[PDB]
Design a protein around this ligand. Structure first.
Ligand SMILES: Nc1ncnc2c1ncn2[C@@H]1O[C@H](COP(=O)(O)OP(=O)(O)O)[C@@H](O)[C@H]1O
Ligand SMILES: [Cl-]
Ligand SMILES: [Mn+2]
Length: 443
């Protein structure tokens, strides 16, 4: 692969939108890094997930790569070194340090990731590019704005449109279990995944479940051959490689929405249709192997473009408005994503301890951006957990249709009733478990 010379020039942002599997991560990336080093550029590589980052550092092992952990706010050497980190790690460091290096070449892989930390990162990056302080490459077949759900592939894909179960089934879906080979099944939620996986397991199928929280331990198991089904949330759209012959995709997802009628709260709306980019990335899990031309994409429904009510857009602004810049400037969203919110640049900016608490609630507290923002801008200290118990009766959190009760750090049994309700902290057993740990003052 021959690298273009102009992509290393400051004020240039290159959208590397080669089709899924074309060789963006595996082939051109090491070529770009080596060429960046030759030019003595201060280089940053951004991976969507910890797993993908680990694959990058394994592949770039011969080069002066340094993986950067979010447990560390900055890490500067007096040496020629390429920094490697997750999208979210970059955004956290921007919020928590003034010692963020002045990278003049930034590569964001799987730059289609729509999680707020990634949207915020693209905002900061593009701002630096447009200010003439950096060159950046966004690697993704589906850049922000894409609407082709059936892009080019390395090998032919059989696109099959048919009814897909939303829940456990007894009969009428023989084609699912009769299939000889491996399947990746995209589900709209973890608990939808729990039910589907349970159904497949009672049929004697070996299934691995994937979600954001379990991705690190569960994904490596898919690299072995002792499995029939992967049941996964949208997280697998971000550079997850499966050696499988089929994707099952009912093209559905949950969408966080900030509601403003009465007390502000985040709900999880849907299931709703995925975006055409998401559908393409799910489909793009297969058709990757030149030697295997039998791959199937089994789908249901049309994708939906309009996602302007997605909470991730205002959450991205809450992050961006609090990002430290050398000049003191407020960075704006990436061009094509500016339309997604009506927020006035800088309206979410916090000062002093409130800004510090905002960051702490996200990184140490594991809370969503919106929820962290509401607590921090209320003037509440990080260790002060009273808000988890002082909400209105409607804010009572249920588990198995019964009221959740928590032992506090002071040793009192209080009903879990937060002042601010964000559906994501009680969306599934694991999220609730983590949030109970927060409410009981255990982190
Ligand atoms: N660990 C691996 N070993 C061998 N081949 C791989 C590995 N990971 C990916 N590939 C293959 O390399 C090709 C390009 O992959 P990649 O660079 O990830 O595509 P993309 O352009 O989507 O980033 C694909 O055909 C893929 O199947
Ligand atoms: Cl998830
Ligand atoms: Mn890739």
């Amino acid at each position: 692969y021959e690298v273009d010379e102009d992509i290393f020039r400051k004020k240039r942002l290159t959208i590397m939108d080669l089709h899924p599997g074309a060789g963006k991560t595996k082939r051109i990336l090491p070529s770009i890094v080596r060429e960046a080093l030759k030019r003595r550029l201060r280089t940053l590589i951004l991976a969507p997930t910890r797993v993908v980052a680990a694959e990058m550092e394994e592949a770039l092992r011969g080069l002066p790569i340094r993986y950067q952990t979010p447990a560390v706010k900055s890490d500067h050497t007096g040496r020629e070194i390429v920094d490697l980190m997750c999208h979210a790690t970059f955004t956290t460091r921007l919020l928590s340090s003034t010692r963020v290096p002045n990278y003049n070449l930034i590569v964001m892989d799987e730059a289609h990731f729509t999680d707020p930390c990634s949207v915020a990162a693209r905002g900061y990056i593009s701002t630096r590019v447009e200010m003439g302080e950096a060159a950046a490459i966004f690697m993704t077949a589906t850049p922000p704005g894409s609407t082709d759900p059936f892009p080019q592939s390395n090998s032919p894909i059989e696109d099959i449109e048919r009814e897909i179960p939303e829940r456990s089934w007894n009969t009428g879906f023989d084609w699912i279990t009769d299939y000889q080979g491996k399947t990746v099944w995209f589900v709209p939620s973890i608990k939808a995944g729990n039910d589907i996986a349970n159904c497949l397991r009672k049929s004697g199928k070996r299934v691995i479940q994937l979600s954001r929280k379990t991705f690190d331990t569960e994904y490596p198991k898919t690299k072995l051959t002792d499995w029939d089904f992967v049941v996964t949330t949208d997280i697998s759209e971000m550079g997850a490689n499966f050696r499988a012959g089929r994707v099952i995709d009912p093209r559905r997802c949950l969408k966080p929405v900030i509601l403003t009628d009465g007390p502000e709260r985040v709900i999880l709306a849907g299931p709703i249709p995925v975006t055409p980019a998401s559908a393409a990335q799910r489909r793009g899990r297969i058709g990757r192997n030149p030697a295997q031309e039998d791959d199937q994409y089994v789908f249901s429904g049309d994708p939906l473009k309009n996602d302007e009510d997605h909470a991730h857009w205002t959450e991205a602004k809450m992050l961006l408005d609090n990002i430290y810049t050398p000049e003191g400037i407020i960075p704006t969203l990436f061009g094509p994503e500016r339309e997604k919110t009506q927020a006035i640049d800088g309206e979410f900016r916090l000062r002093g301890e409130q800004r510090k608490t905002f960051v702490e609630l996200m990184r140490r507290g594991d809370l969503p951006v919106w929820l962290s923002y509401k607590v921090a801008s209320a003037g509440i200290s990080y260790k002060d957990r009273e808000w988890c118990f002082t909400g209105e009766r409607n804010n009572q959190i249920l588990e198995e249709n019964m009221e959740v009760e928590i032992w506090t750090r002071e040793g009192e049994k209080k009903k879990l009733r937060p002042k601010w309700l964000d559906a994501r902290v009680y969306a599934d057993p694991m999220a609730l478990k983590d949030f109970k740990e927060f409410a009981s003052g255990r982190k």
